Amino acid sequence: SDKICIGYHANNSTTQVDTLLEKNVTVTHSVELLENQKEKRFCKIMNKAPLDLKDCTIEGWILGNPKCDLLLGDQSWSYIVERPNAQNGICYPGVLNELEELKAFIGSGERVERFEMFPKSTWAGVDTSRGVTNACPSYTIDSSFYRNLVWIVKTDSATYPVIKGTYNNTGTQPILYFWGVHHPLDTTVQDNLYGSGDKYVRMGTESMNFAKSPEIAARPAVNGQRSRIDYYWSVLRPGETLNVESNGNLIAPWYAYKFVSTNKKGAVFKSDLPIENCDATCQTITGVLRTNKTFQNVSPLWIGECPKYVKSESLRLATGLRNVP
């Protein structure tokens, strides 16, 4: 007798899926939706190389710590790599005010161009050339100072006069710039450097003003210094003008950066990982993913076009049927 039978496919698959009803069900075909592989390195994104700060922090880079000269000048970057043990940051002890908001502003950019904003001749009747300190050396000169700032002191002869400077930002780009106020450990050093009298630093713009006075006091020694500097930063917008006025204690702006903002989102990765000559479309803090999968369990932090981060080990979707060979 003739048979006709109805039936279904089987094969040699041992791949399994879960359902609400049943765990470890072997199926003929399935697709894994989650990526768990990464190359442990940093690559170019959109063909642009990241910026390796090497043995400098963001602070050291952007203030011009003399041991950060290899970074000096123009930079372009897809993202920034700060090495977690970098030694060269703020050499002369003090606080950089609004540091976290600075680290965020810098991260939102893609290029800086360094330029002289105030030449030293700006400041009349003062010494611009002995503003240097052993807290803050080069690899060759063991007494130096930040390359983007000038520590102004009075001339031997004289009084510290009122000094003034103005800069009109007639460009198309916003300018990131820096200054400070010196806080000597005691009165003697105050008088040496700046003379006697109530001292001030004042600055202003069509939209900001600033005014600080020295706070003389001995604080705990850091790189041999019981004095301090308070560092400050700001952004002179296109069309704005800056006026600087001081009669003492000014750590003046010298060089600043024309800053260009990213329409994208930017990143600052604190990592040990090597930077290699490779391209990539997705870069996570812990490595690059090269994948077409729609999920990943590597890292929530990245730039580029990455898959959605989830905590799963696996996300395997059945396509075929239950395999019974």
Binding site: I4, C5, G7, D18, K308, V310
Partner: protein, 170 residues
């Protein structure tokens, strides 16, 4: 399966049916073999492919966590940020993990249904010109050559012709 066919009143599948997911095995005087039903297989390939691509497509956005730092006087917003970032991670992890669980259940049912419906189609044509035999197989009460086999598969069987032999063989 919920439709009862796959593993199964039809226990077991066929490694020998290479060209489809669902189909037929026959035996008669001219020989024997395996042959997929192309229409129902293909229509399932299109459906499952669309399901996979729809899931891929709807999951195609990303919550973007951020590397910003916080001072020792910003413990509150620092923690707001952390609680938020973990919050979305937990929501998406749930959505994906449950979706996969639910969809895999419903995919097995779909295959199960397609097998069952195939079986039922054959059953309606054959009626009492064959004996069921309970494993999704039918023994004809008559001589069924290859043309008659193709007849059953393409949906044009012709019970009246065969009712003859079938009855007296019964």
């Amino acid at each position: 399966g919920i439709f009862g066919a796959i593993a199964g009143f039809i226990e077991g599948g066929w490694t020998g049916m290479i060209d489809g997911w669902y189909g037929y095995h026959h035996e008669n005087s001219q020989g024997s073999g395996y042959a997929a039903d192309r229409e129902s297989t293909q229509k399932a390939i299109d459906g499952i492919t669309n399901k996979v691509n729809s899931i891929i497509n709807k999951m195609n956005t990303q919550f973007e966590a951020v590397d910003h730092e916080f001072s020792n006087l910003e413990r509150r917003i620092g923690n707001l940020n952390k609680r938020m970032e973990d919050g979305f991670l937990d929501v998406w992890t749930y959505n994906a993990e449950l979706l996969v669980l639910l969809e895999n259940e419903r995919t097995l049912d779909l295959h199960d249904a397609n097998v069952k419906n195939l079986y039922e189609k054959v059953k309606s044509q054959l009626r009492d010109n064959a004996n069921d035999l309970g494993n999704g197989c039918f023994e004809f009460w008559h001589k069924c050559d290859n043309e008659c086999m193709e007849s059953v598969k393409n949906g044009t069987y012709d019970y009246p012709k065969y009712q003859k032999e079938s009855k007296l063989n019964r």
